[PDB]
Design a protein around this ligand. Structure first.
Ligand SMILES: *[C@@H]1O[C@H](CO)[C@@H](O[C@@H]2O[C@H](CO)[C@@H](O[C@@H]3O[C@H](CO[C@@H]4O[C@H](CO)[C@@H](O)[C@H](O)[C@@H]4O)[C@@H](O)[C@H](O[C@@H]4O[C@H](CO)[C@@H](O)[C@H](O)[C@@H]4O)[C@@H]3O)[C@H](O)[C@H]2NC(C)=O)[C@H](O)[C@H]1NC(C)=O
Ligand SMILES: *[C@@H]1O[C@H](CO)[C@@H](O[C@@H]2O[C@H](CO)[C@@H](O[C@@H]3O[C@H](CO[C@@H]4O[C@H](CO)[C@@H](O)[C@H](O)[C@@H]4O)[C@@H](O)[C@H](O[C@@H]4O[C@H](CO)[C@@H](O)[C@H](O)[C@@H]4O)[C@@H]3O)[C@H](O)[C@H]2NC(C)=O)[C@H](O)[C@H]1NC(C)=O
Ligand SMILES: *[C@@H]1O[C@H](CO)[C@@H](O[C@@H]2O[C@H](CO)[C@@H](O[C@@H]3O[C@H](CO[C@@H]4O[C@H](CO)[C@@H](O)[C@H](O)[C@@H]4O)[C@@H](O)[C@H](O[C@@H]4O[C@H](CO)[C@@H](O)[C@H](O)[C@@H]4O)[C@@H]3O)[C@H](O)[C@H]2NC(C)=O)[C@H](O)[C@H]1NC(C)=O
Ligand SMILES: *[C@@H]1O[C@H](CO)[C@@H](O[C@@H]2O[C@H](CO)[C@@H](O[C@@H]3O[C@H](CO[C@@H]4O[C@H](CO)[C@@H](O)[C@H](O)[C@@H]4O)[C@@H](O)[C@H](O[C@@H]4O[C@H](CO)[C@@H](O)[C@H](O)[C@@H]4O)[C@@H]3O)[C@H](O)[C@H]2NC(C)=O)[C@H](O)[C@H]1NC(C)=O
Ligand SMILES: *[C@@H]1O[C@H](CO[C@@H]2O[C@@H](C)[C@@H](O)[C@@H](O)[C@@H]2O)[C@@H](O[C@@H]2O[C@H](CO)[C@@H](O)[C@H](O)[C@H]2NC(C)=O)[C@H](O[C@@H]2O[C@@H](C)[C@@H](O)[C@@H](O)[C@@H]2O)[C@H]1NC(C)=O
Ligand SMILES: *[C@@H]1O[C@H](CO)[C@@H](O[C@@H]2O[C@H](CO)[C@@H](O)[C@H](O)[C@H]2NC(C)=O)[C@H](O)[C@H]1NC(C)=O
Ligand SMILES: *[C@@H]1O[C@H](CO[C@@H]2O[C@@H](C)[C@@H](O)[C@@H](O)[C@@H]2O)[C@@H](O)[C@H](O)[C@H]1NC(C)=O
Ligand SMILES: CCC(CC)O[C@@H]1C=C(C(=O)O)C[C@H](N)[C@H]1NC(C)=O
Ligand SMILES: CCC(CC)O[C@@H]1C=C(C(=O)O)C[C@H](N)[C@H]1NC(C)=O
Ligand SMILES: CCC(CC)O[C@@H]1C=C(C(=O)O)C[C@H](N)[C@H]1NC(C)=O
Ligand SMILES: CCC(CC)O[C@@H]1C=C(C(=O)O)C[C@H](N)[C@H]1NC(C)=O
Ligand SMILES: *[C@@H]1O[C@H](CO)[C@@H](O)[C@H](O)[C@H]1NC(C)=O
Ligand SMILES: *[C@@H]1O[C@H](CO)[C@@H](O)[C@H](O)[C@H]1NC(C)=O
Ligand SMILES: *[C@@H]1O[C@H](CO)[C@@H](O)[C@H](O)[C@H]1NC(C)=O
Ligand SMILES: *[C@@H]1O[C@H](CO)[C@@H](O)[C@H](O)[C@H]1NC(C)=O
Ligand SMILES: [Ca+2]
Ligand SMILES: [Ca+2]
Ligand SMILES: [Ca+2]
Ligand SMILES: [Ca+2]
Ligand SMILES: [Ca+2]
Lengths: 388, 388, 388, 388
């Protein structure tokens, strides 16, 4: 085994082809399936895994009540091969209400945060042993990506925040060799509020498209130099913006350097990536709530903050159906690195009151240089007909 | 590992011996089992896998209601080792209401079609990653084999159809190397309507026995040349016909070049293969609906449309029990390649109205050069006692 | 991977020590467990597996009513690692209402009989594929060991029988190289009725202790010579006899050559093995029923049909608890071949009417050269309380 | 594969970071989970496994009633990967109401005890086969560690006791090479009563911190020399003592050589390990009950029996929540041997009467040299609401 360098060009991408879907909530109506949220996909050199933070209970279970709450001591990082639903034989790989995982080509890293809000612990697990931990620095919800970290040459980088979800916070970027923290750099550049980063390799470094939970409906971008540990940061230029909430396409604007200040409060984890001066991105279809999901390419969207020229829209989940988090993951091919993404399909509370629980299922798409058509792959469960 | 060439002669067949049976519906009255249809079997160099298209629900479950419907966004391809029932830990390998898979010797290829009826997408997945896709070309249910594809020296071939199910359609033969579509031939020769091909390697090429849904109750054959990508086509000569519906053994007739026009409308997926000038084949026992299943050899049935002389008949499923799709798979022995087949056992709607679901179990048999007896292996579930 | 040849002397044995227990019936009161009978154990060069003949249903399931019936088309051979009970992701490896399996050093052989009573088929599955098959020769319930077959230098051997359960029958011994029946010797010697041989390697040949269902309560021995294919047979001398029914310890008698003729009709599968002129053996504790199970050594019991001198008795199952079939398997150690045995713990119909089903669980012991205490390890389910 | 030698220095430890949590009881409210007790953790060279003793039943099962009882014939050793809860595909690896397992770098040893109280058998199982066994020596509950044994250069050591739980008993230390008992040394030195050793490698020896069920609320220490099988023993000096019951902190005292005589009757399996002259240790938070769990370093606690100077307390389970047994396990990192521990979270009878059953879940922490914060990770099931 050798380390992953990801030293290959990014695949041509004309859009995205259907890759996976686990019908988890549908299955949980006549089967024992975990209650989860904040899923993500990451792959080893051979195959892909679906990860999620479980709520320490199955769906049909009295303990599914109040799973709307996102940090308890019962939450663990669940790990299956992609498309194996989270049944009872699933491995809980660490204790976590916030995580990130990646494979460096030799083994798995998990970064798992659990504990008190004001005094959380991050565990660093490499090759199924605990190799390090770090305490919260700002004593206010230590939290990380909820999607894959990125390793190059045996150095994994990951992005962590501690501090306000509505004001300056302390974002750091950790550099990990075999589960050992070898460096911590602090967020630098003009990105003002960075959460829940979707990172992807972009040799020779990593790039991340995050959530601005404070004053932005544009998403931040963090670049990480893996060799000198330097950081830079800014925002996705595209005039069509990628956060929810946001302003409609006719009213919306952006900036390459600052939060656009447009319905900036709150957000949702999402992703984007560059393709020369254009940008690929997904977002909820509905501007104010997490309904629907679509991807498109904004032409000049990476370098021109006035560009509102999209093409190649695909509906992934139609606007009448629920979405949630999304994130990127990268997959090595023969000649090129491909880009894929998952969409968390959230069902239950608070939005939907006919059940007492909150959970999700997922749908995953991947980049293609070929052709594709259309459709919509929502969750599909009838909550009117699920357990009392 | 090495590429499969299939470059050994076909085994002697004196008939087929019992190989596998999953008792899926019988288990689902006391277990969480998937609801499926369009199953099939394919094997890697070491062992055999059973596939089916899920309905994104288990049987005992509110979402099993109305799974008579064959194309929904919830359908996925399920893959277990052969003889492992589709329990809740079964892997969904891709999104699909129509699929074909095969192993080229080094890795699996899955061909997976989902999306809108008029704008469906085929995904190609190889060694666990999405390598290609293609849009529907004629905007009318892009569909494929529902049984193993076939790979020779690195090149996998698959047959796909887009268009009318009761008139001319556009059928093509894709050539795929490591999941990459490298060439695309159009259906050629005298086969007028082609669906749901059962293909096998017949070195140096591939042969398929398909379902003419339009004007034939005889079965199309398609020869695919893997090196120059050429395609010839015709019908199964044998005067005993393999489609359902069809006319009885007395009235029935055929033709080597054209559909017979005998209750030719509609059909059922099936197989047949050549043994010199004789043909081994299976079919439902009943002439007009999917009841029973039988196999025999027709002496000169491969090459003489007037041949109505069968021998070595075996009842696989008796005429009072439901049957369904059936297809071929091939397995490499020490010195020869063998031919096996599965038979889908369909239970539920529309035919059986005591339940709201439609699902199936499978039985599987393999070519033997030894001797054998008699029996019947139906589904064995009591729908009158089932999860009501 | 080399072929096993068992060319090491038998281990010293002082008795047997607890090895494994699957608690299958106790679990199926609150989970999905298969209904089974006719279990056995065989091991690959690394680990052991447990087998049984499924009834195509789980216990808590409408389909388990009437599982007293030992031959249906829904029966399949189950295979897990030893100690993994037969839950829903258990692999069915073949269609079988009678079977035998073994591993030859490189791969599994499985011998699986199913079909009509009057015309059953044996299928021979090696290294994942069907390689051969035979019809019933005498058209009366073709059947085989229900326990491990034995392979030496790549030749496996299995004893099968076709014919009357209660008068002269046709017993053959097949030799199988890589799934291929390379020879068939007919039964020869003194043994007059032979069923369910529990065989073991005894380099350079194989030995079996069987069940006489006709006029013997002494158990038959069958010697199989693997190079010349010759067959001798006789009975186990011991004045203490293995079969059930039998006459009590005071009244019983035996013969090194002929059925002893005492309550001989009917029987139960069991085992014994020589140790110089002494014999190790197990048997039920009730002389008339499949209640309890014991093992002891009979001093000179292997060459003196007058020896009723036992020692080293162990109760495996106490006398007020149900037992059933029992069988030997062999396990290669560093310097010697050890011998072990399993005991089928039959619960339900017809002997127990609180339930509708019939099933078993199993307990497994292994030869020890060290020391050991006492106990009882019954099935332990409360049928007064199980599923309706 | 070489044998583990553990010839690495012990890791710097500043405290413990969360590693794993199985949520077993929470899950059992809506799934098929095993009833267990006396859990522990042990790792092969790659990954950790969670072991426990089952009660031969699942929780939502009639047979969970009276699982308070700790030696039945239906108790088996359960073994999964760490994080996979004990569902029905869980392997039972031997018959046990008492056990110890370790990996020597080449394979697994399991030491398994079952049988009558007055006449129990210990079976030694290595590389998946029975290699040895030993009878009870004092004919009064032969019993062993309930945590990992330790192997150095292929010689594994284990600690077993037989005799009174409240008076002088007969404690032996066995030495086992690939399954074979090669030596038995007897306990020696000043420890007067020794149960349930939590042992760990301390090159070139092995060191255990045990439970005095007689007169000591300080914990016995046993040292084991592996080359010449000599044994020394004593007690943990620390004035803060590990056992439950014990005296409160103000009132307690200890002794380096003798049971302290302070509420000695009874106790609980627990652990400790030296760090210079300092001691790391855990214990229940409540002095008299198995409520809560905590860890700390006692400054000079290893050599100064009057030290009561704790630092680096961590709460693992808050004091309003139930704990239970705990023990150590060692994981080899790149340059040092780490120390970890697991805590049994007992729920149900007799302490809690809302349910008829007794079971547990587990939490696992591992030593860290990094930093960490605070929390509490209890069982989290609600019995007011569980099955029935
Ligand atoms: C079958 O499936 C394929 C693949 O999914 C569909 O083709 C896709 O259709 C999308 C919807 O029309 C196309 O995306 C749109 O692209 C427009 C591009 O503008 C074009 O100008 C170029 C030259 O520069 C021309 O080729 C095109 O003809 C266009 O006129 C965008 O303007 C459009 O953006 C918006 O429209 C949407 C609604 O669609 C609004 O929601 C949005 O706010 C904005 O006003 C959108 O991005 C997509 O590119 C195309 N993809 C490919 C690869 O061809 C077929 O249409 C499907 N057919 C059926 C019958 O379902
Ligand atoms: C035990 O197990 C074996 C294996 O299944 C059974 O043997 C099979 O029985 C089948 C039915 O008898 C045989 O298939 C038939 O083959 C017939 C050929 O008849 C022969 O005539 C030729 C040429 O004149 C001779 O060479 C042969 O020796 C035969 O005597 C077909 O005519 C027949 O075709 C039909 O009959 C069926 C009903 O069976 C109709 O449905 C059909 O429409 C048509 O009129 C049929 O195909 C089969 O070959 C034979 N297999 C082997 C290997 O022997 C035994 O019958 C079973 N024994 C018991 C007691 O059940
Ligand atoms: C703890 O666990 C051990 C091992 O399981 C028990 O020891 C075993 O006890 C058995 C039952 O007594 C022994 O087997 C018996 O052997 C008898 C022969 O008498 C002995 O023979 C030699 C010399 O003759 C001497 O070594 C002995 O000292 C004895 O005198 C057999 O006669 C006896 O056979 C029968 O008795 C049974 C009832 O028990 C009848 O069912 C039967 O029909 C027949 O009349 C039996 O085979 C066994 O060898 C022995 N094992 C070993 C290794 O020593 C301890 O007894 C256990 N302790 C407790 C309290 O349970
Ligand atoms: C966030 O998380 C970290 C790590 O969990 C916490 O820091 C830990 O807090 C513990 C509780 O105070 C510390 O353990 C205590 O250590 C005391 C030692 O006193 C020190 O003297 C040293 C040097 O000699 C100075 O540096 C310090 O100022 C210390 O004061 C012990 O005496 C103390 O002992 C007891 O108090 C406990 C607490 O109730 C009693 O139950 C007990 O019986 C006895 O009377 C205790 O062991 C721990 O060392 C410290 N760890 C580290 C690595 O820093 C933060 O406190 C957390 N913060 C929040 C806001 O949650
Ligand atoms: C739960 O278990 C109770 C105690 O069971 C006794 O010991 C166990 C180790 C077990 O193996 C069991 O067989 C033993 O009887 C049961 O109470 C016992 O019930 C039996 C007959 O029902 C009675 O003769 C015993 O005296 C009684 N023992 C005690 C200590 O109560 C429970 O059975 C129930 O409770 C009984 C008291 C009775 O009311 C009956 O209706 C119940 O079946 C077991 N509980 C349940 C819900 O099954
Ligand atoms: C699910 O949980 C909710 C929230 O805890 C429960 O509602 C509470 O009920 C308790 C006691 O039953 C009341 O004292 C609280 O004031 C309620 N809280 C709120 C926020 O409404 C509810 O009972 C649970 N429902 C079920 C079916 O378990
Ligand atoms: C259980 O079965 C009883 C006997 O059934 C007979 O044999 C079985 C194999 C079936 O073929 C069945 O149709 C036959 O009647 C029934 O008489 C009885 O009603 C059944 N019990 C229940 C509770 O359903
Ligand atoms: C703590 C701030 C962070 C948003 C930036 O909240 C996230 C919001 C969530 C959301 O927007 O759905 C749910 C996440 N589980 C949550 N994480 C934690 C640790 O609370
Ligand atoms: C669309 C025509 C095609 C066969 C001719 O329909 C098949 C009919 C079916 C059938 O005959 O049972 C079920 C198949 N799932 C269906 N395939 C799809 C993709 O709809
Ligand atoms: C057919 C004779 C044979 C032994 C005499 O019957 C066995 C007896 C049985 C028995 O005595 O329990 C049950 C076995 N399942 C059965 N096997 C078959 C194949 O029917
Ligand atoms: C027999 C003495 C022994 C240690 C004191 O008791 C242990 C105490 C127990 C306890 O204190 O919880 C439960 C253990 N299962 C038990 N082990 C056995 C085998 O009884
Ligand atoms: C077969 O079907 C035709 C109808 O086309 C009918 O006339 C004929 O009698 C049937 N044959 C037999 C043998 O029953
Ligand atoms: C064929 O199937 C139908 C099922 O509805 C039945 O009524 C018909 O009589 C059957 N006929 C034959 C000849 O098998
Ligand atoms: C054997 O079992 C039967 C079954 O009930 C019982 O009646 C009988 O007493 C037992 N006989 C002996 C001698 O143990
Ligand atoms: C400790 O124990 C005694 C009871 O024996 C009690 O008097 C005292 O208050 C306790 N001390 C503390 C600090 O709780
Ligand atoms: Ca925002
Ligand atoms: Ca047709
Ligand atoms: Ca259930
Ligand atoms: Ca007999
Ligand atoms: Ca004590």
């Amino acid at each position: 085994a050798e380390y992953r360098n990801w030293s290959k060009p990014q695949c041509d991408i004309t859009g995205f082809a259907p890759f996976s879907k686990d019908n988890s909530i549908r299955l949980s109506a006549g089967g024992d399936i975990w209650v989860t949220r904040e899923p993500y996909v990451s792959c080893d050199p051979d195959k892909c895994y679906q990860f999620a933070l479980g709520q320490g209970t199955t769906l049909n279970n009295v303990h599914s009540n109040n799973t709307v709450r996102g940090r308890t001591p019962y939450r663990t990082l669940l790990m299956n091969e992609l498309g194996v639903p989270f049944h009872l034989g699933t491995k809980q790989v660490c204790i976590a209400w916030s995580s990130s995982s990646c494979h460096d080509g030799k083994a798995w890293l998990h970064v798992c945060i659990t504990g008190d809000d004001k005094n959380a612990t991050a565990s660093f697990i490499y090759n199924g042993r605990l190799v390090d931990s770090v305490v919260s620095w700002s004593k206010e919800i230590l939290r990380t990506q909820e999607s894959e970290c990125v390793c190059i040459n045996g150095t994994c980088t990951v992005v962590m925040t501690d501090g306000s979800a509505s004001g300056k916070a302390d974002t750091k970027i950790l550099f990990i060799e075999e589960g050992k923290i070898v460096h911590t750099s602090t967020l630098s550049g003009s990105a003002q509020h960075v959460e829940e980063c979707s990172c992807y390799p972009r040799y020779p470094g990593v790039r991340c498209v995050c959530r601005d939970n404070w004053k932005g409906s544009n998403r931040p971008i963090v670049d990480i130099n893996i060799k000198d540990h330097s950081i830079v940061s800014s925002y996705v230029c595209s005039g069509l913006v990628g956060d929810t909430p946001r302003k409609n396409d006719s009213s919306s604007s952006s900036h390459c350097l600052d939060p656009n200040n447009e319905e900036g409060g709150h957000g949702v984890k999402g992703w984007a990536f560059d393709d020369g001066n254009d940008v690929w991105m997904g977002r909820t279809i509905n501007e104010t709530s997490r309904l629907g999901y679509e991807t498109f390419k904004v032409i000049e969207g990476w370098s021109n903050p006035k560009s509102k020229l999209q093409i190649n829209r695909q509906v992934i989940v139609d606007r009448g159906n629920r979405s949630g988090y999304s994130g990127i993951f990268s997959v090595e091919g023969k000649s090129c690195i491909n880009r894929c993404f998952y969409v968390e399909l959230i069902r239950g509370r608070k939005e939907e009151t006919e059940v007492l629980w909150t959970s999700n299922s997922i749908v995953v798409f991947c980049g293609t240089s070929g052709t594709y058509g259309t459709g919509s792959w929502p969750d599909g469960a009838d909550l009117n007909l699920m357990p009392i």
